Design an enzyme around this catalytic site. Sequence first.
Site, PDB file in Angstrom:
ATOM      1  CD  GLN A   1      -2.657   1.365   2.439  1.00  0.00           C
ATOM      2  OE1 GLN A   1      -3.606   0.598   2.445  1.00  0.00           O
ATOM      3  NE2 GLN A   1      -2.439   2.237   3.411  1.00  0.00           N
ATOM      4  CB  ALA A   2       3.551   2.518   2.201  1.00  0.00           C
TER       5      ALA A   2
ATOM      6  CB  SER B   1       5.590   0.398   4.462  1.00  0.00           C
ATOM      7  OG  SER B   1       4.985  -0.874   4.327  1.00  0.00           O
TER       8      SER B   1
ATOM      9  N   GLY C   1       4.486  -2.948   6.745  1.00  0.00           N
ATOM     10  CA  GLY C   1       3.423  -3.791   6.200  1.00  0.00           C
ATOM     11  C   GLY C   1       4.011  -5.172   5.953  1.00  0.00           C
TER      12      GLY C   1
ATOM     13  CG  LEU D   1      19.990   4.026 -10.839  1.00  0.00           C
ATOM     14  CD1 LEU D   1      19.252   2.689 -10.787  1.00  0.00           C
ATOM     15  CD2 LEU D   1      19.268   5.069 -10.035  1.00  0.00           C
TER      16      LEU D   1
ATOM     17  CD  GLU E   1      27.430  11.210 -10.635  1.00  0.00           C
ATOM     18  OE1 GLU E   1      26.912  11.057 -11.768  1.00  0.00           O
ATOM     19  OE2 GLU E   1      27.730  12.331 -10.153  1.00  0.00           O
TER      20      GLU E   1
HETATM   21  N1  GTP Z   1       3.816   7.696   4.095  1.00  0.00           N
HETATM   22  C1  GTP Z   1       2.896   6.702   3.884  1.00  0.00           C
HETATM   23  N2  GTP Z   1       2.915   5.629   4.722  1.00  0.00           N
HETATM   24  C2  GTP Z   1       2.014   4.623   4.545  1.00  0.00           C
HETATM   25  C3  GTP Z   1       1.038   4.689   3.458  1.00  0.00           C
HETATM   26  N3  GTP Z   1       0.292   3.563   3.514  1.00  0.00           N
HETATM   27  C4  GTP Z   1       0.754   2.830   4.554  1.00  0.00           C
HETATM   28  N4  GTP Z   1       1.781   3.467   5.164  1.00  0.00           N
HETATM   29  C5  GTP Z   1       2.558   2.971   6.312  1.00  0.00           C
HETATM   30  O1  GTP Z   1       2.996   1.648   5.984  1.00  0.00           O
HETATM   31  C6  GTP Z   1       2.932   0.798   7.144  1.00  0.00           C
HETATM   32  C7  GTP Z   1       1.862  -0.248   6.835  1.00  0.00           C
HETATM   33  O2  GTP Z   1       2.283  -0.937   5.662  1.00  0.00           O
HETATM   34  P1  GTP Z   1       1.418  -1.006   4.349  1.00  0.00           P
HETATM   35  O3  GTP Z   1       2.254  -0.587   3.152  1.00  0.00           O
HETATM   36  O4  GTP Z   1       0.070  -0.389   4.515  1.00  0.00           O
HETATM   37  O5  GTP Z   1       1.270  -2.615   4.239  1.00  0.00           O
HETATM   38  P2  GTP Z   1       1.321  -3.528   2.924  1.00  0.00           P
HETATM   39  O6  GTP Z   1       2.751  -3.381   2.372  1.00  0.00           O
HETATM   40  O7  GTP Z   1       0.217  -3.214   1.975  1.00  0.00           O
HETATM   41  O8  GTP Z   1       1.304  -5.009   3.604  1.00  0.00           O
HETATM   42  P3  GTP Z   1      -0.042  -5.908   3.973  1.00  0.00           P
HETATM   43  O9  GTP Z   1      -1.150  -4.931   3.783  1.00  0.00           O
HETATM   44  O10 GTP Z   1       0.361  -6.372   5.330  1.00  0.00           O
HETATM   45  O11 GTP Z   1      -0.030  -6.976   2.926  1.00  0.00           O
HETATM   46  C8  GTP Z   1       2.444   1.695   8.285  1.00  0.00           C
HETATM   47  O12 GTP Z   1       3.619   2.187   8.942  1.00  0.00           O
HETATM   48  C9  GTP Z   1       1.732   2.834   7.579  1.00  0.00           C
HETATM   49  O13 GTP Z   1       1.748   4.034   8.362  1.00  0.00           O
HETATM   50  C10 GTP Z   1       1.087   5.878   2.586  1.00  0.00           C
HETATM   51  O14 GTP Z   1       0.279   5.990   1.632  1.00  0.00           O
HETATM   52  N5  GTP Z   1       2.021   6.804   2.855  1.00  0.00           N
HETATM   53 MG    MG Z   2      -1.812  -3.763   2.253  1.00  0.00          MG
END
Ligand code: GTP
Ligand code: MG
Lengths: 331, 430, 54, 437
Positions: free
Chosen positions: D11-12, D140, D143, D252, D254
Amino acid sequence: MYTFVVRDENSSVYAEVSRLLLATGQWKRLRKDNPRFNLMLGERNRLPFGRLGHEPGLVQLVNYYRGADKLCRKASLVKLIKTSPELSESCTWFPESYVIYPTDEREVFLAAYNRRREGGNVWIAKSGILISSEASELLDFIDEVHVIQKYLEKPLLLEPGHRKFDIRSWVLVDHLYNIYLYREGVLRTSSEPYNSATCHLTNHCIQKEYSKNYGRYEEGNEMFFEEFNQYLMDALNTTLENSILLQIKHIIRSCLMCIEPAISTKHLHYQSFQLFGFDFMVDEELKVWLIEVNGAPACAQKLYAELCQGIVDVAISSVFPLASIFIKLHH
Amino acid sequence: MREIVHIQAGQCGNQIGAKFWEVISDEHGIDPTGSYHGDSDLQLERINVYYNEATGNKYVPRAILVDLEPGTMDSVRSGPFGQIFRPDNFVFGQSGAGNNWAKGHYTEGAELVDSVLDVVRKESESCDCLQGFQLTHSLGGGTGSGMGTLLISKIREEYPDRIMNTFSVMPSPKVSDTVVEPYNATLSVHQLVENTDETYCIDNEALYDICFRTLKLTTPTYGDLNHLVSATMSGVTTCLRFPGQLNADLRKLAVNMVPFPRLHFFMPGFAPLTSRGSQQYRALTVPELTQQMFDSKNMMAACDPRHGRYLTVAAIFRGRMSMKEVDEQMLNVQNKNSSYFVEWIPNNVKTAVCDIPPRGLKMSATFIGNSTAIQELFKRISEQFTAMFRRKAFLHWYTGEGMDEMEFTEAESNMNDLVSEYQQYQDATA
Amino acid sequence: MEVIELNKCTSGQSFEVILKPPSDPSLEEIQKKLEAAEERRKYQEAELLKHLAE
Amino acid sequence: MRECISIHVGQAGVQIGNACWELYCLEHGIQPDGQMPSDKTIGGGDDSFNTFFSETGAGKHVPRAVFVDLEPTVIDEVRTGTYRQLFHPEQLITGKEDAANNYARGHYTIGKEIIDLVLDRIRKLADQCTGLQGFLVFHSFGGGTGSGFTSLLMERLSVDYGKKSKLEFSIYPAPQVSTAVVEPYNSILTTHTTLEHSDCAFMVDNEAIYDICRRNLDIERPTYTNLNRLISQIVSSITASLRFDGALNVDLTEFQTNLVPYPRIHFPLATYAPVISAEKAYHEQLSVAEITNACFEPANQMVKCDPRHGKYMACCLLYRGDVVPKDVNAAIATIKTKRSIQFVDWCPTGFKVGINYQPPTVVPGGDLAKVQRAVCMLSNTTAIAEAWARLDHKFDLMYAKRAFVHWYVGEGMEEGEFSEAREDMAALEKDYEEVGV
Ligand SMILES: Nc1nc2c(ncn2[C@@H]2O[C@H](COP(=O)(O)OP(=O)(O)OP(=O)(O)O)[C@@H](O)[C@H]2O)c(=O)[nH]1
Ligand SMILES: [Mg+2]
Ligand SMILES: CC[C@H](C)[C@@H]([C@@H](CC(=O)N1CCC[C@H]1[C@H](OC)[C@@H](C)C(=O)N[C@H](C)[C@@H](O)c1ccccc1)OC)N(C)C(=O)[C@@H](NC(=O)[C@@H](NC)C(C)C)C(C)C
Ligand SMILES: Nc1ncnc2c1ncn2[C@@H]1O[C@H](COP(=O)(O)OP(=O)(O)CP(=O)(O)O)[C@@H](O)[C@H]1O
Ligand SMILES: Nc1nc2c(ncn2[C@@H]2O[C@H](COP(=O)(O)OP(=O)(O)O)[C@@H](O)[C@H]2O)c(=O)[nH]1
Ligand SMILES: [Ca+2]
Ligand SMILES: [Mg+2]
Ligand SMILES: [Mg+2]
């Protein structure tokens, strides 16, 4: 309700501050590793500064300045004074000093030591201490990290007794880097006649252990400012403030302002205060010399109550308000 | 499209199960005929978690209704929302279970359980990506307790990698005079410790005391009790049912709430506490919600949280409110009572906020605690169990169905072990 | 304060300023790890189903 | 010209990727359409921006990007969003159920089932490169997918593309926006497994960003949308040199050469200024001296730590806007007298400076104000180890009781991997302290 933790059990000063805080009813003491504190009374070594100021919804304060050790270690202080333009190689209130490693400024020390003998060349090696005029002997003592410092051959001697002393001043630096000099200092006196050729070290422990005359002139070889000022007036027609304290305040300010950019917590995610013990020698001419700075000082018994209350009022309640004994050294 | 399959068993199970479906159908804008008539897209975005779609855009609860006697299910089918359920998903016998765990688990329930599993299978097969199961039942009777736990074990065998969640109603002599309920409940807890991932401990002792003490109902009814249960069930499933970041599916919830596999018994709480038709006119402030949701008086399990420590906490706020104020207040609870949160699980309190308030309230908050104080509940059941079992009293009702005393001894030992494990982490330091 | 290696173009420039001088695992190994973990899952599941069969 | 492929994981990674590619399009004059009027060469180019965009015969400019998530909701929003025409479906990869905030689920259980697909999809982008220089990977720490699947992907990239550089943009976990109690576990696990496979990694602590948005954009309670717009500006600052004509950090390799003397110590600190609220009616434009001085304030760093109490190994200043070298050098001269800036003995005390004359681009209706000049500082300082110390301590607290460990062992991970990862982190902390004290 404010919260705090205690991580140095061996601190007489912060034991009392802690007692005082609880007595307010508005402070609660947490288990030492609970991270949800406002105030940390930290450990003397490897204080986890990196873990401070990352707690949502808590303003966090700690009773040490990260980096203040540069002032408070013998070798670091020497290096700091030589290499800071604010203090400089030419700095007239700190005895000539050199850093030496056993087994480094050795050559430089000899270079000026040879100058001294041709044509008063007593020095002192600090880590047990050794005072000697033989350079060769001192270097051997070190070998079996030290500073070699010019030994003040002409101290101011108190009468009756013909005895040397040192002055301890307590300084509180708050989170705004206000510099507060505690009203009361103490003279740690030798109870022996100063012998040019136990009587050279004003250390309280050493006096108690090795002196027959411990305690005759004053309680526990400690003279306080009121008496000392009266002595200065009667014997020398001057005052503590004029002959000595002006210099003392100059030195304290110079040292702490020097180090301010490096340790200030003004724009930091946690805040610091710290209590310092500055130690001074004064010579025959009423010139004041800085000996060292202590980062974790104890206090004199009859001054604990006032000083510790002052710490709470100035360093703690200033940040965490509840529901002067200090002279502000203005920059 | 992460589907949950819902099962409700026995009288209590079907009563609170039916109320759950009434309450969340209204929240999602689904009427008793299965037609959607809501005004917000938020209502439908995750509707497939609990509902199947038919033609005519009908929404049908993914719900299976089970009992060993027809009475409560006849009631449900003749209730307001009776038509909403899939007729083939009504699975029932005629014999009843006579408040007897052995009849539910071993004899009467065994004759019916394959029929139930057939329906469960039909529902699971229809799922894009099944999350797991939720079961509503009481522990004090025979069908929900005995047959309910039988079902849990059979479902785990067919679906071993899916999450099993229960809403389990604990008996209390404050609400029932049936003498064997501590036996039924102890036998059931033994099953739950081994086979569920998450169990919400809904305590009839707490429910009655809230009604009597706080709501000032001099003669509480099951209707009053179930009003509290359905409010709680709505609150604790909010993150599953509406768009959101935190605890948005059963597995992520479990990973956040369950630090050790046996310790998966949760203390729910809710604010504001209301009676049916109290219809109150002042919304609570965010500070009020926060203070009340953590208060002992608002817990649905009769345990004093101040007698234990929180391993983990989930908090869910519903309504239009300042998220800034929510964060501030939640931090205040933790920073003001930090000693009640175990220090060896950093940041163990998670908060969700959902814009849609429950019916009749502008503002509400739901609490889910994994607290070591829940041992008080199991201790209460254990004391009632041992008072009878030391004299083997009433055991003939169970040995008549083929059970041996050894099975009782093992269940008792397992629950006493559970109690001791909570105490262990209560006293544990970092 | 010595500036070196000044490069210019229509888009911008770059340079360096000096204040003071000085004073693995195979595809095979990965596949094995993923399969060893899979076998541990399968073993743990097998134990559960055995327990449920009892 | 040498191509770069961006990979966005979990997601992140995906949502930050959305923000970045939107910003890249604005900066380069590419429409959601995928069309770029200014590109007079149709159907193919040797231009610097072709490092990040390929071209179709019809003149569509397509990101050299792969989006991967184990669950479909987030990538579904890209598919149906503003920039849906930009990407082609094979670039957007989703599974059915996610890693449930569990490194082991992402790495072992689900990662095993989708890794070959993802690699085949990356392979397809690589086949359209005449000189692929490597990868930029966004994810992230916290996650299950971001931590677990990324580390699997990084291991396999080292195998399939051994010569190629790999840079990370990693989101470090913060309780104010975090969604799992076990994020410290996932962080340590993924850092351990990825450490040898990453040449340079830019960590962004959500806590730092969160507070910058509160303090400087006057946002009461920042959303991921607020956070990601700020992050994308920092990311754009860092990758500008790959996408525009220039002579600093032009490939990259560099980045490692300029920022990473020691391979394990490969986590540069980013600091950015100025961050100004678009709602601020009256705003005085900040000078080169002011924005450069701002680079040495912890309040503006991507990770809160104190570089006064570490040492520097390298420092790069990346300017955008109305900036000339004379003003940079005057600013630096002054700052050096005022500030605590100590390099390690075996490194020159100095700065590499890049200036791009185009001021930062901001998203119309975003939170950031347009400014006439901005700067991103990249410094490799030992002070960033404060973040490892923080994370490691949280790990230690939970792991001592084995809290939540059964979730990992249940996915087939051995418990010994926890302590192996933690040992690696202990050694890493030790490396920093040796270099810095
Ligand atoms: N800066 C930022 N942080 C994010 C975002 N989405 C999630 N996070 C952070 O990422 C961590 C959660 O991981 P996610 O990326 O949501 O999880 P995922 O990689 O999708 O993994 P699963 O959902 O467990 O399969 C937490 O620390 C969140 O605060 C975003 O859009 N921006
Ligand atoms: Mg997720
Ligand atoms: C405290 C224990 C339960 C709660 C009450 C309650 C049962 C009830 O609510 N019952 C008996 C099914 C009917 C129901 C209510 O009528 C009274 C209807 C209106 C209802 O609440 N119906 C709800 C909406 C319906 O969903 C429903 C739910 C469960 C079952 C059936 C129907 O009646 C006061 N009971 C037994 C009692 O108060 C009985 N008292 C005792 O048992 C006392 N010991 C002798 C103690 C335990 C309180 C008296 C009747 C002698
Ligand atoms: N250069 C010098 N000239 C004269 N006397 C000196 C001196 N350096 C030290 N002394 C004497 O030695 C005594 C102890 O010195 P120093 O302060 O270095 O030891 P110390 O730091 O371990 C004790 P404290 O921490 O309480 O000050 C002082 O009281 C002073 O009288
Ligand atoms: N809260 C609540 N408790 C109930 C309800 N119906 C029965 N119970 C309780 O459930 C237990 C009896 O189990 P019950 O479900 O009636 O037996 P079953 O039909 O054999 O499962 C007793 O502790 C009752 O107090 C109800 O509608 N609400
Ligand atoms: Ca072209
Ligand atoms: Mg000392
Ligand atoms: Mg009944």
